[PDB]
């Protein structure tokens with residue numbers, strides 16, 4: 001069991017997505033980069049430094065947060081047949097809560 | 099309303115107000131490109147974007163309930179309860195409409 | 198009791214004081230590209246764009262009633278009550294025309 | 297009456313003067329791309345652009361009467377009384393020509 | 396024993412990934428540099444100057460850190476049959492710690 | 494006669510380069526303007542206003558300076574036929590001195 | 592040598608330390624896209640760029656004699672007495688190689 005620690009304002013997200021199944025039985029993956037997804041925040045970076053080496057701008061997401069994000073610019077990472085993505089917090093569109 | 103979408107930064111959630119326009123023959127042809135502006139209702143607003151330094155969030159100029167005119171370009175479609183929603187940057191909001 | 202359009206940021210609502218480009222055979226050739234500058238009347242103005250400190254809005258240099266020369270590029274057409282309007286950035290306004 | 301034009305921001309109104317481009321065959325050829333720079337006279341100047349903070353308009357470096365060298369690109373042609381004028385950003389002005 | 400010193404916010408990384416063979420014995424390299432990799436930070440730049448130009452903003456990686464990064468924009472450098480990459484600290488996605 | 498006064502951070506440069514024939518007596522000029530040239534600074538603008546709005550950032554070239562520069566983005570100006578160029582101080586690569 | 596080149600801003604003059612690579616037949620083939628990074632010696636350095644304030648020049652992180660790795664892209668070739676030189680921004684310098 002490894003432990004990934006995102007840098008700057010990048011976060012690690014666990015893809016809660018599932019490929020769509022065609023009626024004929026074919027399964028087409030979601031190569032869709034523009035297609036936004038819903039996942040869970042697993043790790044967050046410290047935050048980006050401001051103009052001067054003063055303070056880190058806290059992120060607006062935390063571990064456990066369910067979020068909607070864009071895959072574009074993201075980096076896929078698999079671990080124990082698990083899908084993960086490393087993306088900038090600016091790609092996160094919104095947080096979904098119950 | 100079990101689920102609740104909370105936009106980040108200066109993005110907002112808008113509920114599209116419109117209807118599939120029909121052709122004289124009885125056909126409906128939507129707008130996939132999303133290049134025409136639209137009218138909708140602000141459902142949720144983000145906190146806003148952090149200023150240069152990072153000590154203040156510049157408040158947005160729209161609020162829940164506001165009817166606005168916006169550009170779908172760059173926006174993201176989200177359906178829920180057969181309802182159409184769009185997540186866009188407040189910069190895409192052109193004006194607020196008020197009777 | 199009537200719909201009123203309110204421009205966000207430094208955008209302004211302008212009304213049409215010109216007609217479509219005419220021809221020698223009578224055919225009306227509209228401009229879809231919107232590359233020719235036009236002349237219109239400022240109908241509504243936005244509050245202005247926030248400075249940086251998030252402190253003050255930089256007032257615009259146009260007011261309702263002003264006749265202005267502007268670029269249609271980047272503008273958004275809006276028709277209401279049968280009149281043609283345009284929502285554009287205050288940066289697209291070239292000059293104010295006064296008697 | 298004779299309406300006057302009032303440039304906004306750092307834009308200025310310039311009056312153009314062009315030589316006879318008559319080719320040998322008595323054919324004159326205009327510059328559509330407006331790539332070639334020209335010489336003209338500053339007729340009106342804008343107040344100047346606001347600063348980031350919002351405490352001053354940075355004065356322009358040209359004044360009425362100044363003969364200047366400028367790029368037509370980005371400029372907007374305006375013909376009043378047969379004469380040709382141009383509205384351009386002060387950034388397009390290259391140099392001021394003085395006797 | 397020449398030693399490389401990265402400038403600004405660039406870091407020198409040692410690629411520790413391994414060419415993969417095809418079922419035919421062939422070997423296929425990744426020239427486009429679009430796939431992220433895992434490596435070890437060998438040297439780090441002082442960091443970028445702040446707005447005011449008085450202090451540099453320290454980087455969030457240190458020598459010995461195992462990182463996940465994007466090869467895009469990076470520059471390959473070989474020395475003693477060892478593969479190295481000079482990249483911007485912005486290309487480093489996360490630090491991997493056992 | 495007349496004296497050109499550059500605005501902002503633009504400068505007037507007098508081209509010193511001259512044409513070069515071929516083995517056939519032919520001459521090929523540089524329409525592209527991608528080759529850098531050597532010339533003399535004739536007049537310099539006041540300099541660009543700081544973002545603040547209270548100070549002109551002095552340029553690093555003075556009249557009489559021989560400089561190497563890029564013609565790209567430059568504007569040609571012929572007077573008494575002397576070939577001149579109006580370019581941004583940012584196109585000035587270096588100053589050549591004895 | 593007599594004439595000496597003095598780089599401006601944060602640009603530096605580097606002396607190309609790269610060589611030819613003859614093919615088995617004889618004929619040697621050189622670079623041409625300028626994407627391949629090179630190694631060379633810093634011969635001269637500019638004073639550095641003035642911050643936004645304009646009160647101070649941010650010193651460069653390279654000095655004369657430094658052996659550096661750099662990108663030729665954006666560089667400008669300069670020959671003299673047979674030796675090849677390049678004028679590039681200090682931003683193209685990747686690292687300093689020391690022994």
Ligand SMILES: [Ca+2]
Pocket residue numbers: 050054055151152153
């Ligand atoms: Ca701060």
